[model samples]
Target: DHSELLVNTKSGKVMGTRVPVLSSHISAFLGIPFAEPPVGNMRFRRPEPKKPWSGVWNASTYPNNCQQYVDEQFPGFSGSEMWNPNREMSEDCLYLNIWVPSPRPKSTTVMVWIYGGGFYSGSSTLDVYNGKYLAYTEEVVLVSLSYRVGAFGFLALHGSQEAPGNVGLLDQRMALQWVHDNIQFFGGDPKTVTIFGESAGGASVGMHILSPGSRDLFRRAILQSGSPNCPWASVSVAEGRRRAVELGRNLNCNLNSDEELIHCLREKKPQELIDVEWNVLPFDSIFRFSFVPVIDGEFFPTSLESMLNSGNFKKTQILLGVNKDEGSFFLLYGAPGFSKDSESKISREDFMSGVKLSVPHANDLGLDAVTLQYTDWMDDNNGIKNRDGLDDIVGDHNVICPLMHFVNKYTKFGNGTYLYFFNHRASNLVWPEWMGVIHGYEIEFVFGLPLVKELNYTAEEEALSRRIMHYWATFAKTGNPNEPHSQESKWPLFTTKEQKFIDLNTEPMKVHQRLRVQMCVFWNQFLPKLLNAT
Candidate 1:
């Protein structure tokens, strides 16, 4: 009997061919669409359900990415030059892909993955996202989705609005709804769905967890390398409106009314929006350009913290984590390069001064105490051991610590929460011999992909990758990650009493008691309040 199936796509009906591997053990499906293309009048609107068609549609090839400016900042890291050859972009991109083990099981758990690219770049087609190994090895269905990106996905417009902003998020919600309704046809249990992502994708998962529209869509979530408490996660409606006005000015159009601006922007070419001076504005004094989820009083009624504290998500199982070197990737890629001598000569006092500048409220709780704690940490660790030690410290305090604190507060509400710290570095990818287990190092292990050619995997690293895949898959299947088949030690749940996290390292996996507890406390006291009055 043929294993291929027919699926309804927005373009037309398509046939999704199932790639059968390992006989009756693992069945796979690729390139499924969940929504109609949001182009022309559909642009800047909530995702419309894909209209059914008469004929079978071909799901063999991958779809085009949403209109986005190809990132030139990280040359080799952005995959091949051919995949994204210049600023040539389009807006008609709304597609999703799925991989499922076949034999039409009754009710197996499901996992949906959302890729991260700082809200501007990324696609479901990336090699690291290949779900074959994850599905076959773990015995669950896996889904990957593609949504609008950059201007096409995140542009906030001032006008007689239709969709207004957050089209990307709406697209994600639409995809989930699609799976909730249709994934059972392919052997998935809609009720046991888990949403997982990294970076912007992780932030997206948090937003979904908080959105009223997304309530009860998924039973669990895993946020890796990102959190909802980050500045990028929550923006004011007024700020988003202001950005729409600025975008109007950039387009040389009038913003006399919301409708007028929306029409003008809608009429403008997608590339026109892509080519504009676009920045997420996470740390800028003037917060005008950061295109993120806004407290719209509808989509996001309250800040994530407020909602979590109010016990809105008491029933959802959540896993929150960050890398040990979360900031090294940013420093290496985004920061200006410096000579080894200059970096080595920088004093601890000078570094702490920069930290104070970055986090002005450091003195609110006594600067001396803060300085002493950090100084002691560095001294005990032998004077900032890593080459990018300063970057690690800044990144951890700024991003990771806040995330853990956010998790801590939520777990207090009686939710099942798991926290992890990724300390393993890919032996092959480190360049300049200085980049430790940098940000996004977990992607390789999470996806269970082979090491990139430049990087070689040891027997231990290969085993570690298998272990991570097992943990992730087990989490997706059931809320708990501890599986009967796991070879590694039993992982612990995150709690206020223990404050333990799984230490994902090159050596024996063990539980560590509160990595950087002092830093987390100091930063929690100093985090800026979300000025959103909503």
Candidate 2:
């Protein structure tokens, strides 16, 4: 049996364990409650900081994932299995995990992770999120926190303290506060903190940058494949209130007053709320999630554009990027022929209709511009080519364009911004060969999953994983990613004119200019002109 590793935190003394890594071991402390359980009377309110415990708290087992409907693995689906909430579910899940290396220095750089699941479902307990290897190999402190999701997390009301909305983001802010107060006990520098995440988590990271309450909590941020500007990442406060009212009505709660509705909601079983799925119109499927972050005056004072335009937010060293084929991963969900076969094709009709359905707000002229811009004129009739074209449209509209807009604005106000395009897909993905580096695929490299012996990763993949981990760690240590790793090509600073970004692949990574430049220009620049003129 391994001896206990104890650390005295602000809340209490926590007992952790040391797990063997490459040649030494890493101190892992799991299920450390940062806030009191958000259950019963405290259900919909913002998280309260955990009170100091009388005895040493056992920080061993992984924490329960926040209440969510766990997806069952479908026989032939690509996205079903990996995204499941594979741990116990509970409303009392506001916990954080930390990994510290053995022979730790006085104060090491800290990297905190927030996970993404369309703001509906995700967990820090997933196998993919384990932070030990990253902590050990990279010689930094790695942290991940659990936050609420689904209706339980984002339920909104106009002027009610009972359910003041965006409590999920508030939950993250609470955890960051905990880290700032107690991380020095774990040999982590509270000052040199970098918050990073992918997808919904990435958007959460961006939100923290804009949030006034989150100031001085972090010094750098990494947004991968998602940002607060993403169209589906958040909804207007009016829309959020409407969804909350509708959720109550669907579940038979009296909506005469916010007090009655919130009280009724708190009494219902957690599963009952998660099971309440809302029906969406054909065009509305573009904004897929029923529950998401809201432009609550507290977390988000105004529109994301307004905040960025006025430079009214925290400006820190930033490293943000997108995958080469971010949208292809989404096609597996409901795209007609996509799931039927690995090489299933998209016809011209399906592609055209898809554009209209996903981009309904755009006028006919704007829609035609989208169609013409994405059409592969050389082989316009080929289904595969058409599929690729559709992929480009979906990825650009939902992911790439938002990131480009944020980066364009952020570069003006922030310092030392670096960007990357993840061009490599691991050999282990069971999906079709045509899906090039789909969304969330780059997280494995960032987490050093390839370095695990049991995972059976190729040597080349392991090498690439090392370089990515180096860049992430180096950036956390210093604001610049190019430091301490002179062997690798320099990751250039992102600027408005040069717009240079690295292509993350195997060894000898290539630095390129303007990844998907034309597509980004169409969505971020030209498409807006079309919509406004129409």
Candidate 3:
């Protein structure tokens, strides 16, 4: 009984359960509430910090995930089943999980994880997100927090106190404040905290980098396969309000004013809000993230590009990058139900339709310029080649180009910046062989999932996972991935002059320069100018 892992936080004492690792165990404190549940009247408002409890809080159980609909369209084939929220769902789900190194390492570094689901669906309690291995092997404290998603999280009612936008991000910010104020009791250094996330979580990290409200919360940041500048990441307030109004109308809350609409939405059940049809534009079916973070004057005072240029945000040592096939994950979900069988073997019809549909809003000249860049003129008719070209087109516009632009901006105005390109595919992937290094594939390796023997990961994969965790945790600890030793190929700092990035693969990680130079140039420079001319 005396050996129980009890830590006295500002709120109260909490007990943690021990998780068995290789030779020893790590302590896991789960289901600790960081804020008051955003239930009933508190719906859509900024999260209020949790009040102190009178007695010891039991932290043995996992928390409820924010309410989200399960992906039923080609679930397993699309990898959506892997990330669907498995825990109970509720609006009262503002809880966090923590894993601390056993035997109590003094002043351990902290790595907080945020998940990605296009800002609509994700949870902290997913099987792939478990922090036991990262905490034990890397000698750090790992934290993952749950935030509301979909309309529950991002619905912005202009000039209304009850429904300020980006409340989901506000949930994350509150959790960081809790970490800064209370992590010392859990044996973590308040000064050396690092925040890293994937997809929407990556965009959250990028937004935090830009937001003055979040600038002081962490020392380092990592954005994997998403950024605030990504085309699908954040939307303008006008568009966001339009989406919210549409949702309200669909849910039978057709009110006249913003205040009335929010009040009407507050009265409806959480499930009802999630059940409303996701209205997507025909041209933007590839990027139908209906509810997402917005440039609320408080959270993001101006445009993300303006903020990036102003140098008015956190200058943390940041590591960020995209997967090799970030768009392949979204390919299957492109059409009605899905187009799975021919997803990899793209036809001429598929390629042209995709090109036209993906960006119908852009002028023909902009589209023409982009299409020419991604097309393989040599083998133009080959389905396989067409698939490759389409994948690059979606990947570039959605994730790769946006991240590169942000990196360029960071190098100009920010501190030490490192970029990576995840080019390795796991051996045990259940999806078709054509899905190479798709979005979220790098997550398993980053979390050291291969080390789990029952999962049946190959030795080569386990070694790769170990190497990735070494770079990630070392970066979290020392602000440099090559510190403590230079055994592996050094991951050079990504500077404005050279713009090099580490190509992470199973065969010895190597440094590469300016990933997808032509595609990046097309999306970042060429297409933008053509659109502006139109």
Q: Across residues 1-534, which tens digit of lDDT does each residue of candidate 3 receive?
A: 245488888998898888888778989999999999888888988899999998778898898999887788765543667788788888889999999987866688999998889888999998899999999999999999878898888887757788878999999999999999988888899899999999889989988888989989999999999888888888787877878788888877857988789888989988788777476322356765788888878899988888888886788699988888887767766733225554467777778777775665687787777678777788888887777777777788889889999889887877788899988888778776666787899999999899989888899889989988988999998898776655658899999999999888778778889888777888889788888888
Give model 1's TM-score versus the native structure: 0.85
Error of 1 at 59 (Å): 0.8
Candidate 2 lDDT by residue in tens digits, 119-165: 88899988788899899998899999988888777887858888888
Off by over 4 Å in 2: 1-4, 73-79, 280-283, 484-487
Q: Is candidate 2 or candidate 3 better by TM-score?
A: 3
Query: What is the C-alpha lDDT profile of model 1 across 1-534, one tens digit per residue?
Result: 234465443345556665644343444455566788788887777788887666665676666677766656546653233235232335656677777665556678788998777677777777677776677767778888878766567666533357467878888988888888888777789988999998888878878877888876887898988776675455676777777677778888867887777778889987787777464343422112256666666677776778878876536788878887666544443333423224433355545544454343333445454455555463533434433445655566656876876787778875688888898877666343355566666887987764323346776777888888878878777778898665658888888889888888678878888867766765666433321111
Model 2, residue 183: distance off in Å is 0.2
Report the C-alpha displacement of residue 357, candidate 2, in angstroms.
Answer: 3.7
Better of 1 and 2 by lDDT: 2
| Candidate 1 displacement at residue 81 in angstroms | 7.2
C-alpha lDDT of residue 152 in model 2:
73
Full ranking by TM-score = 3, 2, 1
Q: Per-model C-alpha lDDT, please?
A: 0.68, 0.84, 0.84
Which ten residues in a row are the worst by lDDT in model 3? 335-344
Q: How much is the lDDT of residue 176 in candidate 1?
A: 89
What residue runs in model 3 are displaced by over 4 Å at the alpha carbon?
1-4, 75-78, 280-284, 336-338, 341-343
